[PDB]
Amino acid sequence: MDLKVVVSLSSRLYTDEIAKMQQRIGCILPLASTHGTQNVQGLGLGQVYSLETVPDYVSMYNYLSDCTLAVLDEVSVDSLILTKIVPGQTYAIKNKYQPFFQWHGTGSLSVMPPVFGREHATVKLESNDVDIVFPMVLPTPIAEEVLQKILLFNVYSRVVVHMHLGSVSYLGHHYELALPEVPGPLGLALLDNLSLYFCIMVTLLPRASMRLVRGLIRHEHHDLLNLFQEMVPDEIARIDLDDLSVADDLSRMRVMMTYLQSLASLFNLGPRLATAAYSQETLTATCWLR
């Protein structure tokens, strides 16, 4: 099967732009159309991530999850060649991303809009008058962390501690990601769905877990219990004054597991890539689309 997309640049390409795009070989690029020959407009994430002050992340997640992906391998003057990522094939993807997030063995990579700034991943084509930005491919234990940091900065905006939430902290180095103030109507609808889910959580949550954790803060000193600072909250106590029953707790647990998967799919946005056999000396991972 032939998966190869030649993107013919309508203009030429300068030598420094040749070097800057030749540095980004092996980096995943989204594609508007899945066909054999495309133009440079519609390539990359730079359409919805235009040269403006505010970033709109879920407007780019609406772009990333929809359109097809491609891995940049060969780029010369007047044309750059790509290799499509279709489901049902297996690809080798290299760790060629400027925030050096070390990939785990057989982990999961979730491609993402560039959270560490536009200019951290951008090739400016002055001759072709378009601006190609590159989506960041970071592992899902780090990707979920930076997405929840974005949404916690969203819900902590009217209250404001800032530099701790505004930066991701990795074992290699702590990195500072760019944060919007308004994602538009597409971003507030995400916290609308999340707030509806959290409200139905605080409806159907059981009480035996509260009866465990109240007496276990009052009994045992665990590292999972240090964040309370040895304080049992008042809603926990005034709920635990009511006597317990297992018959309602089974019906609460049977609607808790089904809802938690639906809450997990709320942060599962963006394309998911599954890896295999990643070695740090070759920096490549035999990785197929999930």
Binding site: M1, D2, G36
Partner: protein, 50 residues
């Protein structure tokens, strides 16, 4: 239907479907022709798209 203190100049644009004539002198462009290679892009469950 009385006059305000101001006038206005109304600028509009007008598309026109022409029927052009292209001249091009003899031997003005050297070109190299490749080979028309068929491929296999995607095999669906009933049709493969060359």
């Amino acid at each position: 239907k009385i006059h305000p203190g101001v006038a206005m100049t109304v600028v509009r644009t007008d598309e026109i479907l022409s029927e052009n004539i292209l001249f091009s002198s003899r031997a003005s462009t050297s070109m190299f022709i490749g080979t028309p290679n068929v491929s296999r892009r995607e095999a669906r469950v009933d049709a493969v798209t060359f």
